[PDB]
Design a protein around this ligand. Structure first.
Ligand SMILES: [Fe+3]
Ligand SMILES: [Fe+3]
Ligand SMILES: [Fe+3]
Ligand SMILES: [Fe+3]
Lengths: 315, 316
């Protein structure tokens, strides 16, 4: 696979295909192929927010009173989410460079900016509610927790395979990895912060995560639609065995997130337990797979186990 | 012979070591940064956020059909050129950014890239609102019709593409200087056209959009000024006497190109602009730009601002 030119004077007008298309790379929003890119552009700019405009005065008073189990989950989760948002910052540009639909490149560039904002919001949280030494030991949790380090190497390793060897399948699994990250790893993290805010603790950082959650919904639909155009335009490489690979990347990611959520809560967070964490992640994976036309892994789990989250998460 | 950074580098150190070639993890940790000026730039950039479609063009819709042939000739060529500029900025910035080893600087370049996408869209919004689809597409395609416009485009894209395909440190620095020129010279020339129209009462809301773009451009300028200053300090063996002179010459040719383009599209038919005033304005700007990165001016004999009214006019 080779990367685009900066400007291709031999390109044709408009957008021809998602990948491998003969494009100029010019931004011409009234000459686009995918209808849907126009309404995502609009929705994404209207969702703009600045983390520092959200006051944390009451969370400053509550942070010293979290139990040691609640602090244990907070530190390891917020450090992991900061890792996710930073590898997205670095890899999204990587993916956009082979995408030949300028209107899609534009949306990934908006997405990249939004990730930077997310990562910054964690710096704002940690620097405001605690002192510098505690802030730095939360940032460095991966240096002292063997389990967290190996999640980082695993997730970064999929993206890194395409960074060093740009082949179609590698690109293709890289796209799926993004999707899994967006729709599974982050939604687990959100439910922790909503469950503490539901009990009255750290209310304001939970507000910040509802803004992050709102952006994440657009990131999910962006990749959902990216996968389906790619299948529509390359149906010979979307074989029965390639689609099974995606299902299995997803199973493997489910398992990791479940094992991870149980490890940092350690039956010391009131309102979550190991069984509820298991059925929530599996249920979410059923929704994510059908949205891209794949059969669910857990056909027996059809009811939402934590229905209160969807009303709570909205602004 | 530069080398691309990893997605995540487990063996990196905490904080930022250098601009390029540093042992970084790529993690975003805003309270552990080396370039303290990065913080304020983040803040400023975010507070400058705007949405092009929120500015009404209702007055420009009625005025567009009564522009002179000479005004339309200039309007069509300039806005198609500026759309090319922002488009290549949107494509090239991430290529530069991926070699930068200071995460706090990479954050800023990503914000820049996002702002460039908004700029390019602004242009779609103007053209789709003030005229009909067939005229709109003709303005988009003006580079397919006008050989001068095409060669300019190839020239500008070629500097970036020589790094894109050959990642070496000299190609990298020449590309950085190219960016600086693009933003501090080519764009400033385009702005003076739309302000000159609006000063006469024509296309006033189009000019309001360009003030927002101008505002963002100032921040992009200062960003590149600081990136260059730090690269000089940390790579002094590469920044020879001779390479600084090659930067001065890059600016010379950019100045020459922009004057001849400004003169070509206006053709002495835009009231309030003339060939000598365009000459003097571009040269005056290059003196400021070169000074700002510690280099001697090319045109020291042009010391007073030849179009002073622009500074107050461009403000919001
Ligand atoms: Fe995010
Ligand atoms: Fe995201
Ligand atoms: Fe711009
Ligand atoms: Fe710019």
């Amino acid at each position: 696979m080779l990367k685009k030119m900066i400007f291709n004077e031999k390109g044709q007008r408009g957008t021809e295909s998602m990948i491998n298309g003969n494009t100029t790379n010019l931004r011409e929003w009234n000459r686009i192929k995918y209808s849907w890119a126009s309404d995502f552009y609009r929705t994404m700019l209207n969702n703009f927010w600045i983390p520092e405009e959200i006051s944390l005065n009451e969370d400053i008073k509550q942070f010293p009173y979290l139990t040691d189990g609640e602090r244990n989950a907070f530190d390891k989760i917020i450090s992991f989410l900061n890792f996710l948002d930073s590898v997205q910052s670095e890899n999204l540009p990587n993916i956009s460079r082979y995408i030949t639909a300028a209107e899609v490149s534009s949306l990934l560039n908006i997405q990249t900016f939004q990730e930077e904002i997310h990562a910054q919001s964690y710096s704002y949280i940690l620097d405001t509610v605690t002192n510098p030494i505690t802030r730095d030991k939360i940032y460095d949790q991966w240096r002292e927790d063997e389990h967290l380090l190996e999640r980082n190497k695993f997730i970064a390793g999929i993206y890194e395979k395409f960074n060093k060897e740009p082949e179609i399948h590698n690109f293709l699994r890289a796209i799926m990895a993004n999707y899994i990250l967006e729709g599974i790893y982050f939604y687990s993290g959100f439910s922790f912060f909503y469950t503490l805010a539901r009990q009255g603790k750290m209310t304001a950082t939970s507000t910040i995560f509802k803004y992050i959650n709102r952006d994440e919904v657009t990131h999910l639909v962006l990749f959902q639609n990216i996968i389906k155009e790619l299948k529509n335009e390359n149906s010979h490489i979307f074989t029965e065995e390639l689609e099974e690979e995606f299902r299995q990347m997803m199973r493997m990611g489910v398992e990791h997130e479940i094992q991870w959520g149980q490890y940092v809560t350690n039956n010391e967070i009131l309102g979550l337990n190991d069984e509820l964490i298991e059925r929530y992640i599996k249920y979410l994976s059923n929704l994510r797979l059908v949205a891209i036309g794949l059969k669910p892994l857990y056909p027996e789990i059809n009811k939402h186990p934590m229905e209160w989250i969807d009303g709570f998460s909205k602004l």
